[PDB]
Write a protein that binds this ligand. Structure first.
Ligand code: NA
Length: 182
């Protein structure tokens, strides 16, 4: 990792209120994101946050920790998609402050329904099946309110993997802008 009185390259950009989610969503990365989000709020509760997203998704609970923290903190959290934002990556992309959700022209967006599993007694399988169904309905209702789409349309569009271009994600309502240059 490159260094820059001697920061590292990712902490030097943290001074410019830039955070990177360029990895899978899990308890380790989401812990760093939350810690960076909380810290940047304590530094300045009104200056915007710039969260670059290049993530294929991951753990739903880890992602909801990022989501709720983004809404919990005072600063607007602008989200920029580079490369790919899929599943919980795309969800956190659509969760940025409305009007400041960007994506570069060749970035890949993908939304789908939750993934999970359950093995054991039939009773425990039902308990976990109902849990992931509530999570699916919760995420759909949040996606609908953040894109403007009707709830039933989000349902049909997330049953299977749904790949979109940056322009298609803008018209759909997942992002607000598609910039090639500044
Ligand atoms: Na916020």
């Amino acid at each position: 990792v490159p260094v820059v009185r001697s920061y590292d390259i990712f902490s030097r950009l943290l001074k410019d209120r830039i955070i990177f989610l360029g990895d899978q969503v899990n308890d380790a990365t989401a812990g760093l994101i939350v810690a960076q989000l909380l810290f940047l709020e304590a530094e300045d509760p009104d200056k915007d946050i710039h969260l670059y997203i290049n993530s294929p998704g991951g753990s739903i609970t880890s992602g909801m920790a990022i989501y709720d923290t983004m809404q919990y903190i005072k600063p607007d959290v602008s989200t920029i998609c580079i490369g790919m934002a899929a599943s919980m990556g795309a969800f956190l992309l659509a969760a940025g402050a409305k009007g400041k959700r960007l994506a570069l022209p060749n970035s890949e967006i993908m939304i789908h329904q939750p993934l999970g599993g359950a093995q054991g007694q039939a009773t425990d399988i039902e308990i976990h099946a109902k849990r992931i169904l509530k999570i699916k309905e919760t995420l759909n209702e949040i996606l609908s309110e953040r894109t403007g789409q009707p709830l039933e349309k989000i349902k049909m569009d997330t049953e299977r993997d749904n790949f979109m271009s940056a322009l298609e994600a803008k018209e759909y309502g997942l992002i607000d802008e598609v910039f090639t240059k500044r």
